[PDB]
C-alpha cells in the first residue's frame, strides 16, 4: 500500500492577548504520531503514538528545537503578512502550513509537497517538480521572489525526496503492527420511515483503517448522486474510521438500489441491498 | 558583501586586562557564533546568538561575555585575561530563519596571546644568509635563507621583496614558527624562509633582495620600564645584494 | 565526539586523489559541509551536500551516505595549493549547532623528476651569530627529523616553486652557534639519502 508522512502547522494571532497560538501535528497515513502545542505544559514535541516513544532523547530535543523554529517563522510571518496586506493590529489572522511526502508500495518516493495558506486560503505552494512556486496574489509574489533568492525550494526538495522518505520508512517499520495494518469495514444497512411515502436507506461502514473509502449509491447500475447524502469520514477514536451514505427511496421499490463499498482492506468491492 | 569581518588579527594581552574582539557581518544573518581553536581541542563554541538582542553560552563560555546589540555586530569581551585564553578566536555566521543556503561562514580570526608579564614580549632579529657557492656550481640555482629569530609572541608575517617589489614566485616559508625553548611556556620563537633564484639572477649585482618581517607586539601608548627598546608593533628587515663570481 | 574524522597527516603526490572520510552520530542530520583551513588562516567552505549521493564541483567530489552516516570528499588531480586541514561539519537544522570534526591534514607533495639531494653551508651577511645548513633538492619520500641535540634547530620540510623552469624543490634548514656546528653532521637524526652531496 502507499504511505505518506505529513506535518500540519497552524498559527493564529491574538491581538492584545499576546503571542500567537502555535499548533503542530505529524501524521503517518492517518495515525498522528507527534504534537506540539504552544499552550501545553511541557513546551516539547510530545509522543502521540506508542511506537515513536522508542526514539531517544536526542530525537525529542531535536524535534523540539525545530518545531520551536517553525513557531518563530510563523509568528514573524503573522506580522510580515499583516504588513503585506496592510491590515490593522486589532484582528486575528491565521497561517497554516502543510508539508510532506508520499511513497508507493515499493516505499520509493512518489510525490512531495509544501503548501502554505493565509486566512484559510492559498498563499504560496511548492509546485510538483519541487523547484518552483505558485504565488496566489501580488503580496505572495513578494514571498516567492524572496524564496527564490534564498534557495528555499532546493532545501525543501532535499528534505522531501530524501529525509522525509527515509524517516517515513523508519516509522513504518517501527510501528509495523499499527501502521501496516489494514482494517476491513464492518458494514450495516438501516431503514427508517420518513412517513408513509418516503423511506431512507442508510449504508454504514464501521471500524476501517485507513480512512480512504468510497460509498456510492446506484439504481440498476446507474449511479445516483442526485439524492446521495454523504457524511464526512469520522474517527471512531480507537484509530479506526466510520462513514455513512443515505438516499431517499420511494418505499416498496427498495429492490433495485445497491450500496457500493470500496476500501483497500476489501479483496472485492462490496455490494449491498436491503434485507 | 564583505561577509564576516573581524578585528584585530593579532593582540598581546597582559594577565588581567580587558579587551573586546569585534565581529561584523554583512549578510543579515540571524545566527552568529564565537569559537576558539586549539591544537588538541579542535573548534570550541564559546557563546552564540540566534537573533538580535539575545545570546546564550556555548561549550566554553567561562571568562568571556558577549552582546548582540544589532544583527550586524557580535563583540566578544574578555573581562580579565588569563594565559589559557591564548588562542585563535573565530567569529562565524549562518542565516537562521532569515535566509538562504544554511552555510556557516567564518571571520578571518584573531590570534590572541595572553602572557603574565609583558617583559616577555620581544621583536624578532632578522638575518639573511647568502647562497652557498657550492650550490651555484652544482645546480645553477641560488637559495637565500631568511631567519627571523628571538620573537614573542608568535605574531609575525614574512615576505620577500626583490628590487622593491614583493615576490611569491620562488619562496617557501615555514607554516608556523618554532619554539626555541620547548621546556618553557614563555618560549621565544623562530621562523625560517627560503628564496630561490637562478644563478645568473643572483650573480647580477644590480639585484637587491630583502626579507621583511612584520611583528605585532605592544602599542605606542603602553608603559615600558625596561632598559630594552619598547617591543612595539614594527617591521624588521634584512638584506643581501647580488654578487658575481 | 559527534563527528569523527580520520588521521592526519594524509600524504598524497600531485595529480593523485585525496579521499577524506567522516562519520557522524546524529541520525537526524540534514546538512553536511566541507571546510578547508590553510595554516594560520580561517576555515573556508568548499563543499555543501544535502541529499544522498555525489556532488561534483571542479576537482572536488563530495559523497553522502545517510544510512551509514558517512560524508566523504574526493580531491582529484591534487595541486600543491590543496595542502591544508579539511574539516567536515554536520548539522540538523538552522538552530542546531554546527558540529565539526577534528580535521584531517592533507599534504600534497611535489613530483620531483630527478632528485639531487645535498646539504649546503650558507654564509652570513655577517651581523648575526649563527651558521645555516640547507638540506635541499631531495625526494618527497625523504623525511627530515627534529633535533635530539639541544642547541641546534631544524625546520620542517617545505616546498618552493620556481615558476619559470617549472621547477619544484623540497628543503629544510638547520642552524646553531655554540661550537663547531658542521653541516656534515647536522642532519644526523634524519634518514637522508646515500647519494646526498656534501661539498667540502
Amino acid at each position: 500500500g502507499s504511505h505518506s508522512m505529513r506535518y500540519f502547522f497552524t498559527s493564529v494571532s491574538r491581538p492584545g492577548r499576546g503571542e500567537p497560538r502555535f499548533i503542530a501535528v505529524g501524521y503517518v497515513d492517518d495515525t498522528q504520531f507527534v504534537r506540539f502545542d504552544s499552550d501545553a505544559a511541557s513546551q516539547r514535541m510530545e509522543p502521540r503514538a506508542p511506537w515513536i516513544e522508542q526514539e531517544g532523547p536526542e530525537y525529542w530535543d531535536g524535534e523540539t528545537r525545530k518545531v520551536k523554529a517553525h513557531s518563530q517563522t510563523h509568528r514573524v510571518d503573522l506580522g510580515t503578512l499583516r504588513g503585506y496586506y496592510n491590515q490593522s493590529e486589532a484582528g486575528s489572522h491565521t497561517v497554516q502550513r502543510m508539508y510532506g511526502c508520499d511513497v508507493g508500495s515499493d516505499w520509493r518516493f512518489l510525490r512531495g509537497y509544501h503548501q502554505y495558506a493565509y486566512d484559510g486560503k492559498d498563499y504560496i505552494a511548492l509546485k510538483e517538480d519541487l523547484r518552483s512556486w505558485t504565488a496566489a496574489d501580488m503580496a505572495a509574489q513578494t514571498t516567492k521572489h524572496k524564496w527564490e533568492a534564498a534557495h528555499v525550494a532546493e532545501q525543501l526538495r532535499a528534505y522531501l525526496e530524501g529525509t522525509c522518505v527515509e524517516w517515513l520508512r523508519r516509522y513504518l517499520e517501527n510501528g509495523k503492527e499499527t501502521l501496516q495494518r489494514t482494517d476491513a469495514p464492518k458494514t450495516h444497512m438501516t431503514h427508517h420511515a420518513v412517513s408513509d411515502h418516503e423511506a431512507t436507506l442508510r449504508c454504514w461502514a464501521l471500524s476501517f483503517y485507513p480512512a480512504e473509502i468510497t460509498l456510492t449509491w446506484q439504481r440498476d447500475g446507474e449511479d445516483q448522486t442526485q439524492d446521495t447524502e454523504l457524511v464526512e469520514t469520522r474517527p471512531a477514536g480507537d484509530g479506526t474510521f466510520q462513514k455513512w451514505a443515505a438516499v431517499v427511496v420511494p418505499s416498496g421499490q427498495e429492490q433495485r438500489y445497491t450500496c457500493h463499498v470500496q476500501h483497500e482492506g476489501l479483496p472485492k468491492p462490496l455490494t449491498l441491498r436491503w434485507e | 558583501n564583505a561577509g564576516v569581518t573581524q578585528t584585530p588579527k593579532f593582540q598581546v594581552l597582559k594577565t588581567g586586562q580587558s579587551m573586546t574582539l569585534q565581529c561584523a557581518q554583512d549578510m543579515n544573518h540571524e545566527y552568529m557564533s564565537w569559537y576558539r581553536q586549539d591544537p588538541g581541542m579542535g573548534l570550541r563554541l564559546i557563546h552564540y546568538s540566534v537573533g538580535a538582542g539575545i545570546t546564550d553560552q556555548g561549550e566554553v563560555p567561562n571568562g568571556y561575555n558577549v552582546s548582540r546589540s544589532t544583527t550586524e555586530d557580535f563583540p566578544l569581551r574578555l573581562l580579565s585575561a588569563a594565559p589559557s585564553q591564548t588562542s585563535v578566536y573565530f567569529c562565524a555566521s549562518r542565516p537562521g530563519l532569515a535566509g538562504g543556503r544554511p552555510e556557516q561562514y567564518f571571520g578571518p580570526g584573531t590570534r590572541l596571546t595572553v602572557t603574565e608579564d609583558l617583559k616577555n614580549v620581544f621583536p624578532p632579529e632578522v638575518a639573511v644568509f647568502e647562497p652557498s657557492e657550492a650550490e651555484i656550481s652544482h645546480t645553477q640555482k641560488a637559495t637565500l635563507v631568511c631567519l627571523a629569530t628571538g620573537f614573542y609572541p608568535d605574531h609575525v608575517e614574512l615576505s620577500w621583496w626583490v628590487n622593491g617589489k614583493e615576490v611569491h614566485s620562488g619562496v617557501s616559508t615555514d607554516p608556523q614558527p618554532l619554539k626555541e625553548q620547548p621546556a618553557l611556556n614563555d618560549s621565544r620563537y623562530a621562523l625560517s624562509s627560503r628564496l630561490r633564484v637562478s644563478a645568473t639572477f643572483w650573480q647580477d649585482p644590480r639585484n637587491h633582495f630583502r626579507c621583511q618581517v612584520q611583528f605585532y607586539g605592544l602599542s605606542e601608548n603602553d608603559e615600558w620600564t625596561q632598559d630594552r627598546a619598547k617591543p612595539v608593533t614594527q617591521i624588521v628587515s634584512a638584506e643581501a645584494w647580488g654578487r658575481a663570481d | 565526539k559527534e563527528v569523527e574524522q580520520n588521521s592526519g597527516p594524509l600524504s598524497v603526490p600531485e595529480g593523485a586523489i585525496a579521499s577524506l572520510n567522516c562519520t557522524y552520530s546524529d541520525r537526524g542530520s540534514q546538512s553536511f559541509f566541507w571546510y578547508r583551513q590553510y595554516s594560520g588562516k580561517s576555515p573556508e567552505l568548499i563543499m555543501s551536500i544535502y541529499s544522498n549521493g555525489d556532488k561534483e564541483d571542479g576537482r572536488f567530489t563530495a559523497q553522502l551516505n545517510k544510512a551509514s552516516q558517512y560524508v566523504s570528499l574526493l580531491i582529484r588531480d591534487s595541486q600543491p595549493s590543496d595542502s591544508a586541514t579539511y574539516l567536515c561539519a554536520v548539522t540538523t537544522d538552522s538552530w542546531g549547532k554546527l558540529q565539526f570534526g577534528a580535521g584531517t591534514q592533507v599534504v600534497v607533495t611535489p613530483d620531483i623528476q630527478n632528485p639531487d639531494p645535498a646539504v649546503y653551508q650558507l654564509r652570513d651577511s655577517k651581523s648575526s651569530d649563527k651558521s645555516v645548513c640547507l638540506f635541499t633538492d631531495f625526494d618527497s619520500q625523504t623525511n627530515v627529523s627534529q633535533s635530539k641535540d639541544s642547541d641546534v634547530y631544524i625546520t620542517d620540510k617545505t616546498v618552493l616553486d620556481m615558476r619559470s623552469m617549472d621547477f619544484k624543490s623540497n628543503s629544510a634548514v638547520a642552524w646553531s652557534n655554540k661550537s663547531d656546528f658542521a653541516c656534515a653532521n647536522a642532519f644526523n637524526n634524519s634518514i637522508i639519502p646515500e647519494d646526498t652531496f656534501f661539498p667540502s
Binding site: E63, K66, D77, L81, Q155, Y159, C164 | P102 | -
Partner: peptide, 9 residues
C-alpha cells in the same frame, strides 16, 4: 522528522 530549514515569508 521535521524539516530543518524553515524560512520567513
Amino acid at each position: 522528522l521535521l524539516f530543518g530549514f524553515p524560512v520567513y515569508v
